[PDB]
Every structure is written in structure tokens, then in C-alpha cells.
Amino acid sequence: MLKYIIPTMMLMPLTWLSKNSMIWINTTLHSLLISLTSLLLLNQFGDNSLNFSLTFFSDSLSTPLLILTMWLLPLMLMASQHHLSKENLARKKLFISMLILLQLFLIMTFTATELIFFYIMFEATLVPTLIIITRWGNQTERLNAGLYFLFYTLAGSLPLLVALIYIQNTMGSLNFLILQYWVQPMPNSWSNTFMWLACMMAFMVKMPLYGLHLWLPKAHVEAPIAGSMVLAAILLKLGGYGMMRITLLLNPITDFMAYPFIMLSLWGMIMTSSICLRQTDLKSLIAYSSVSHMALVIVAILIQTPWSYMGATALMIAHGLTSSMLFCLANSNYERVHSRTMILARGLQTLLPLMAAWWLLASLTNLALPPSINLIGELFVVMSTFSWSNITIILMGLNMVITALYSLYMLITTQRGKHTHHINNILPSFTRENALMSLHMLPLLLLSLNPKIILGPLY
Template identity: 60%
Template sequence: MLKVLIPTIMLIPTTWLAPTKQVWPATLALSLVIAAASLSWLSNAFEAGWSSLNSFMGLDQLSTPLLVLTCWLLPLMILASQNHLSPSPPNHQRLYLSILTSLQVFLILAFSATEVIMFYVMFEATLVPTLILITRWGNQTERLNAGTYFLFYTLAGSLPLLVALLLLQNSMGALSLITLQYVPAFPLLSTADKFWWASCLIAFLVKMPLYGMHLWLPKAHVEAPIAGSMTLAAVLLKLGGYGMVRVMIMLEPLTQQLAYPFIILALWGVVMTGSICLRQTDLKSLIAYSSVGHMGLVAGGILIQTPWGLTGALILMIAHGLTSSALFCLANTNYERTHTRTMVLARGMQMVLPLMTTWWFVASLANLALPPLPNLMGELMIITSLFSWSWFTLALTGAGTLITAGYSLYMFLMTQRGPTPAHMTALDPTHTREHLLLALHLLPLLLLVLKPELIWGWA
């Protein structure tokens, strides 16, 4: 564990001590080395229990893929932000890189924590760097409003969780994830127990976000700089799913009765956010709403508590992390050239940047879950497990899948096809940096098709 955590912490002095011209190459090189080192964790992916344990941190099948995804994204965020930050003063650039690194440190500690309270503290700590990214480096003046939404939604959801965890600590004496599964189940009967159940889950459902508690997400995504959008879509939403899987063990047997409204909201959200996507004019907003729909499927898969649902949720979390991050990078390459996120004003890009259209095509197909990509594998496992739980769910998941295909193709056709507007004349050509960035997003996605057991969890 420490072979990745300590170099990540040392990235912060590296950014401040490196000569100005070497800051970006040095941090990128070191973060790529860290990402490569983290891949060694995948060799433990076939052990049933915990591995690499020390007093506070450990790996198991659930946390390993998410940790590798976290480490993989830091070099990609650095690559994506370089052009966007080149005009700002050197100290601002160093501060930006330090914030990205601190975010990664908190995420590594959150995903590998073996103690629930430590997980909670790190879960909350990720709020600070993300908030600074949105409110300091966002594009429009709306960013302060977006930051407020983000802060208050997350805090309002997670304060009940703290009380619930303290109550649990009081009654059980320990909150170690390693021993929690062996604790005898409580007969949770009273109304207070039902409130306790809800307060354990609400924080994670807000973070995921569940439809109905999702209003902070489109705002935060649209206003955040590119690295903020990437880390929000790829890793921070997964904290919610990961936390849900971890606390589900303690919430038996209440979940069978109380999960219904949340499953209904999640599946209704798949259809509703898909319909919202079909009407979007703003490219980043469309990608943000699509994340809500995909995470709704993940929430449904986790809440019905079947092995297939859990495996499908984990596969979809990893696949969605890579896909939506790639889509935000593509939206950013468009924005850096055209300075607009409105799709009507920046269409017909295929004539101007033909190679970028190939990346757009692959990312859009991944978003609509084309076989044999892991996106489809995750969605199919969740849809089948939901169908065997109740066949009514097929109406919602089927409609959701159809609408997802619709808006993914709409996004691709709106940005790439059609006549190029007259005002788009002198655009920069695509850079090797951008192609490398997209290759590093989409190649892992394609390679996971060959060895999906790395992200299967305990199946």
C-alpha cells in the first residue's frame, strides 16, 4: 500500500521544488510511475480475502479496481489540464497540481481504509480539494453557486451518517470492515432503527447521486475545470457506490423492506435523466446527466443485494469511470478550440478534426454500452439481476437503455456531423498530448474486455 501512497504524497514537494519549466513533465512522469506501480495490485484480484494489510489500510476485491482507477486518473488529469493552465502564473499551476495530488491521497486512503470512521473522514476530506477546484478554477461566474450546491448537498447527506456510525460504534464496540461481516445481525424493529438505516445510506446516495438528490452534479460538472469534471465523474461518484457496498453488510435484514423507494427512484432516474439528455444544448451538461442515469443502475444493482447485481455494479462503475472521463476530455478539446459548450455552435467537427472524430465515436459507443465493452457487461448483469428480482423493472431499464443509445448518438451526430459553421475557420490542429490522453482512457476499457475478472469483485 505504502509503495503507492508515499510517492503520491511526495508529488506535492516535487511540484513546488521543480524548476518552472520542469513542473508539468516532472509531475506527469512521477504520476505515471505511480499509476504503473498501482497495477501490481491487480495481481491480488483473485484472492478471496484481504491482502496488503497493515494497521489502517488493506485491499480486497472491491477496493482494488477502484484504487487502480484512482491512480490511473491522476496523470490523465495532469495531461488534460496542461493547455488550460498554461497562461496562469507558475505558482497557480503548482497549487493546482498540489490540489489534484491531495485529492488523490484522500481517495487512496478512503478506498483502502479498513476502519469505517477513517473511510468517513477521507470521504469528507475529498470535499475540500474538489470545492477549491470548482470555485477557484471554474469557467463561469456560476461556479460559486455550483460550489455551494456541492458543499451543502454533500454535508446535509453525510452528517446523519456520522451520527449513525457513532451509534453503531457504541453498540458494537468496533467498526473494522474486516470484522463487521462476522457481527451477529441485530433485530432492527423500531422506527428509530429505520431512521438509522436511512441515515447510513443517504450520504452515499447523495454522492452517487440518486435521482432526486442529483441537482448538485450537473452544476458542479459544468462549472468545474477539466480535471475537476474528470475526477468527479470517474472517482468521486464511485465513492458513493463503494460506501453503499461496505455498509450494506450491517443493514440486514431491514434492506428488504426499506430499499423499494430507493430502487424505484434509481430506475425512474435512468429514464428521466436520459430524457433530459435528449433535450440538452450544453455538451458538458449532457455528459453530466448521463452519469446520473448510469449511477442509477449501479444503485439499483447494489440495493437488491444479489451477487450478480453487485458484480454488475462494480464493472459498470469502473467502465463508466473511464468512459465519462474520456467524454469530458473530448468536450474539453472542443471547448479549448471553439470556446463554447453549445453543441449547435460547434458542430461539423469531422471536417476540421477527423482523427478526433474517431475518439468521439469510440467514446460514444462505450457510453451507449456496445458489446463487447465492459459497460455492456455491467449493464446486462444489473438488468438481469433486477429482472429476476422483479420483472416490472424491465420496463424502466429497457426504456433507459434505449434512451441512452438515443442521446449518445445524438451527442455524436450533433458535434461531429453536419455543415461546419462559418465562424469555425482557424482552429488549432489536434495535439499528440490529446491523442495520448484519449488512448490512455479508451485502451484500458478495450483491454478489460479480454480479462474482465480483474474488475468482477467476488463473483
């Protein structure tokens, strides 16, 4: 695994000692090389995980997320120019090295063994997101966005540390195996309820669950495109990965103590799909869409079926790709007109007649068009929750209906019917945005063909 760690380090002094018109080719080329390098990883088989050291290992939950990270970096690094190429050379170099240090801590986080090391790398994942979104937050409340951001994430993720240290010095060390092979059930004293509440509540904050999603919309409407793609895809599915691991302990009380959170997630899934039907600020619709899919994720995690975990990891990866793509398209439209509002920039079936093809394709994946992965995820989660109860399918289907209608509203609102004909500045599509769309939607359809890779440990 250090074979992946150390070139990701050595991609950083690269970016320092290149120059003008010289940083870019090196960073992008070598980051794609690292993407092939971790495409080499997928060996994982049968009996257990595979151990990359006395220290690192990979569950098959961790392999597709890790490959998704190393896929998503060069895409991002191409995507985040033309809104900062006119800024200074030193600040631009600082930006690229910030993202590389970010990816380094994400690989550190996904290939963890010890949950304390996982926690350190969790908040080391946090601190570059802050600096990026505050330094290029590009609107007047990036202040409040970063402030809300860091205090929700830390003050939720703070007692998680205390609970894990307590488990450390009541049950020996913290390999995931020695967390396994030695876990004994823990009954319903109220201390157990608070310990479960601490761990699950910290990751609930990071998903988000419904009562703590106003963390999100400021932190995506006032972000640059790089930090937004980072934040959405890698950080929300990182929180889900954490709960997916540490739910191995504390199964004998999760049944008794899981009832409020499921109901919060269900009624909030309906409410969030409703609230993204009427907002302006098109950038924020993807954020509330993300809360809807993560609410479905949380339903899938708290029910504990192998069906549910297969659906959960597929829904993770497909929603990560959908949201990262759709953020990149919304940034394309904001590069066109300086609005961010929804009802302004209209028309565009006429003009840029193939930008609309990518809008159509992403909108139908967010619909969950059926050969895609997102329907695989949502369908298996609905199967598992119907075996959970004979009643919840009202909520899931009504989620499907309202999800269809807001996603279609995003499609046919801004890109259908009449150009406002006082725009007269939009350029025909560059090669770059076409390349970014091409890098999103080739792997989504290629996994739509052969998806046995991305299903979880309980394959």
C-alpha cells in the same frame, strides 16, 4: 500500502522545488511510475481480502478503483494545461499540489478499514474538489456551484457520522471483518429504520439518486477539466464503494425499507435519460448521462444479489472511464470554440478527421457496444433485476433505447452534416489530446478482452 502512500506524499515537495519548464516532466513521469507501482498490488486471492497493515486492507472491490485512481492522475495532469499555462507559476504549482493531495486522500479513502476513518477521508476527498472548481470555475456561477456542492455533500453526509458512532458503541470496533463475524440482525423498530435511512441516504446523496441530482449539473458545467474528471469518476464511484461496503450490516430491514428508493431510481432513470435528450450545453449531457448510469448502479446495490454486485462494480469502472474520456473530448471542443453550447460547433468530419474516431469510440462505449465493459455491467444488472421482478425490464430496455438515442444525438449533432463556415480558427489536432484519448481507450479495450479482474468480491 504505505509503499503507495509515501511516494504520493513525496511527489508533492517535488513540485515545489522544481522550476519553470521543470515541474511538468517530474510530476507526469513520477505519477506514471506510481501507476506501475499500484499495478503491482493486484495479488488478491480466495479466502478473504489482503491486509496491508494492522490498519489498511484491500477488498477486491477496492483494487480496481484504486488502480483506476492512479491511472487517472497523469492523464488528468496532462489534460489540464493550455487553459492555465498562461497563468502564473506559483498558482500553477498550487494547482498541481492540490491534485496530488486529492489523490492522496482518495487512496486513504479506498484503502480504509475503519468506517470512521473512511468518513474522515471522505470529506478530505471533498475539500480539494471545492477549491479547484471555485478557483478555476471559469464561468460566472462557480460561486453557486461550489456552494450547492459543499452544502449538499456535507448536510447529507453529516448524520452518517452520528449513525456510525452509535454503531461503534453498540457493537465493538469497526474492522470490516469485525463489522463482519459479529454482525447480528436488527429488526423493524423505527430507530432501525432511521439508522438505515441515515447511512443509505448520505450515500444516496453522493451517488446521486434522482431526487438529489441537481447537486450535479452546476458542479460539472462550471468546473475545469481536472476537477470534472476527478468529480465524476472518482467521487461518484467512491460513494458507490461506500454503500457497497456498509450494506453488509442491516440486511434484515433493507427489504422492507428499500421499496421507495428503487422506484425513485427507476422512474428517475427514465426521466434523466429523457432530460438529456433536449438540453444544450453539451458538457451537461455527460453529467445527466452519469446520473442515468448511477441510477442503474443504485438499483444494483439495493437489490442484493451477487449477480447484482458483479454488475455494479463493472458498471462503476466502465462508466468512470467513459465519462472521464467524454469530458476530456468536450473540453477539446470548448478549446476549439468559446461556446460550450451544442448546436454551434458543427461539421468536423471534414476537419480533424481523427478526432471523430475518438468521438465514435466513446459514443459506442456509452451505447454499450457489446465487447466493452459497460455492456457487461448493464447486462448483469438487468439479469439480476429480472430475477428480482418479472416486470422491471420495461424500464431497463426503455433506458437502453433512450440512451442509444441521446448518445447518438451527441455524436451526430455536433460532428455531422455542415460546418458553420464562420469559425475559421480551429487548429488541427494537437498530439496532446490524441495522447489523452489514447490513454483512455487502450485500457478499456484491454479490459474488454480479459475482464475477470474487475468483477467484485462476489466473483
